[PDB]
């Protein structure tokens, strides 16, 4: 083992940031699971031969009670990995059908190297269930930990209507955050729901800004 250790470290970092993403989105995740040592990762999600197996890397998450109160329509979530360089349409159907038969509102799918176009036309094909796509690379660092990236908090519709009535606004007159913005993907931002940004200002310290996903 001279580089497989580096590959496993990359997998461990991606796993940690996936857990952090789920916890931020608002499903029950524990700091015991987040702060997971590399040796524990080896002993748990790696076999004797040093092979990273991702069948058991998958996990299911449920909303916290606070999240249930804040957003009534928070369903269960499903995260899946894959060992293949390219995820196939059969392996993607085994995910979509699984999402349907397990009654999951959201599902997170990742892929090692690339995702074929053949498997990319089914992720938006089964509403209301939402399927989001990610890479094991380009995820090994949580962008929300970057000091330039501020704190984004998804705003519930109850306080969104309060903001809109306070500023006498349409949804369209707010500053806009792109649906494909990396933080929007992190937050799992559907279109139409506003995000609150706590900006650290050089002049006035902390002030709250708002964007809308659209």
């Amino acid at each position: 083992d001279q580089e497989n250790e580096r590959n496993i470290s990359r997998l461990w970092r991606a796993f940690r940031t996936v857990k952090e993403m789920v916890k931020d989105r608002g499903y029950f995740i524990t700091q015991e699971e987040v702060e997971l040592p590399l040796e524990d990762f080896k002993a748990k999600y790696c076999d004797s031969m040093g092979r990273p197996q991702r069948k058991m890397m998958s996990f299911q998450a449920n909303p916290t009670e606070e999240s249930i109160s804040k957003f009534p329509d928070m369903g269960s979530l499903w995260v899946e990995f894959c060992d293949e360089p390219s995820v196939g349409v059969k392996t993607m159907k085994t995910f979509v059908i699984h999402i349907q038969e397990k009654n999951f509102q959201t599902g997170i799918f990742v892929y090692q190297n690339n995702i074929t176009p053949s498997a990319m036309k089914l992720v938006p094909s089964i509403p209301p269930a939402t399927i989001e796509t990610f890479n094991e690379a380009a995820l090994v660092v949580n962008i929300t930990h970057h000091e330039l990236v501020p704190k984004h908090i998804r705003l519930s519709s109850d306080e969104k209507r309060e903001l809109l009535k306070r500023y006498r606004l349409k949804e369209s007159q707010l500053p806009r955050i792109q649906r494909a913005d990396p933080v929007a993907l992190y937050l799992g931002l559907k279109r139409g729901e506003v995000v609150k940004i706590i900006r650290k200002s050089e002049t006035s310290g902390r002030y709250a800004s708002y964007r809308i996903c659209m």
Binding site: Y167, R168, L169, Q173
Partner: protein, 101 residues
Amino acid sequence: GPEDFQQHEQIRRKTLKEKAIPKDQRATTPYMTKYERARILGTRALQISMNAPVFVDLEGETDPLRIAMKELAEKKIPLVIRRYLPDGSFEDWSVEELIVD
């Protein structure tokens, strides 16, 4: 014929009444802004120049803008500022209800 106008007038009045913000819940600055002060002075000066009644003692003065400044000092300007919110909704603050500076 005329009833089309009656409908249009009803709609205009209804939209006006919906846009107006009632006095009990206007959330704008108590202070008169510098722009409002300048325009109140200018408009009151114009009205005095066009032979309007004046509510202050003229100390043998001839400048309409000076007369308006005197009226503002003694709070005798019969004007109202209609502050416009971005959505078209508006509030109404009287001149004597505002504090200069």
